[PDB]
């Protein structure tokens, strides 16, 4: 739960920038 | 030594405070130096475009000394399950961040240096073979910097 | 070695990041570090405060890698010819990131490593023993933090 | 002149805190 929120967040900020 | 330390500590106090007014100007002491700005920037940033879903996931955070570690392995094992990315690393970071400050919060300042060891070992042994693949930490620096 | 400079450079990385989460709640992870924010907080708030002031002195810097070390010396002596105290010292810092800033501006970053030499001699010899008679670093934390 | 003016905000800055 946590490290599915914190994944989805992690992937939306490296699809920002990388 | 006593002595030495003083002097190791007033050097370190000196560079300290120049690398940080270089990085105001967009300028570095180093490479190293450089990538720790870009780290802190990039985590500031994280945490504040995605502050609902940080501050949520944070306050799922139930730790006792005796469920830290395996909190934390758990979620890092599960972040990084099916890929490594910079946004991932961030992630990882900020993560160790809101569980440091939030053992302070609950008297459990012995989890601070824990976490760091924790997170350091997880660094070196399961990141860093992707870090060097994309390009190392300069890459980073490149791209959130 | 590459390895374990490798291993030394992620363990510093976590601890810095570590170290700038934990005082963003005002929270510190060591007295060191505690002293590295005040310092830091400090000499952005005087740079703030006395903004006009600071960039009138500042734009009187006209430095040359040879007329540097002068330049350097010359201003700190005058600083603290009638005494010390904690704000000629947030001036002293204030002072020597000025001039790597200019340095680095003026493509003289050569200067900024020896700018850095200079004032951690000037902090050992000249200001350590004031700081000591009063109180250390850690009556600066409690005063300027 | 620069020590000077540098010497004057550093004895303001010093009687705000200390």
């Keep these: 739960w946590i490290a599915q929120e914190l994944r989805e967040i992690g992937d939306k900020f490296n699809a920002y920038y990388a | 030594g006593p002595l ?8 370190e106090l000196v560079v300290d405070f120049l690398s940080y007014k270089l990085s105001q100007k967009g300028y570095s002491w180093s490479q190293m130096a450089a990538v720790k700005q870009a780290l802190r920037e990039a985590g500031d940033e994280f945490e504040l475009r995605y502050r609902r879903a940080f501050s949520d996931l944070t306050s799922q955070l139930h730790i006792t000394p005796g469920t830290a570690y395996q909190s934390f392995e758990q979620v890092v094992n599960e972040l990084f399950r099916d890929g490594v990315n910079w946004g991932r690393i961030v992630a990882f970071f900020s993560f160790g961040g809101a569980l440091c400050v939030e ?8 989890l601070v ?33």
Excluded: C
């Excluded at chain 2, 030495?4 to 050097?11: A, C, E, F, K, V």
């Excluded at chain 2, 919060?105 to 012995?110: L, N």
């Excluded at chain 2, 760091?116 to 959130?144: C, K, R, S």
């Design chain 2, 103 to 110: 053992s302070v919060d609950k008297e459990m300042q012995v």
């Design chain 2, 4 to 11: 030495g330390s003083m002097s190791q500590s007033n050097r």
């Design chain 2, 113 to 145: 240096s824990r976490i760091a060891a924790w997170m350091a070992t997880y660094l070196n042994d399961h990141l860093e073979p992707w870090i060097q693949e994309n390009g190392g930490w300069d890459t980073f620096v490149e791209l959130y910097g």
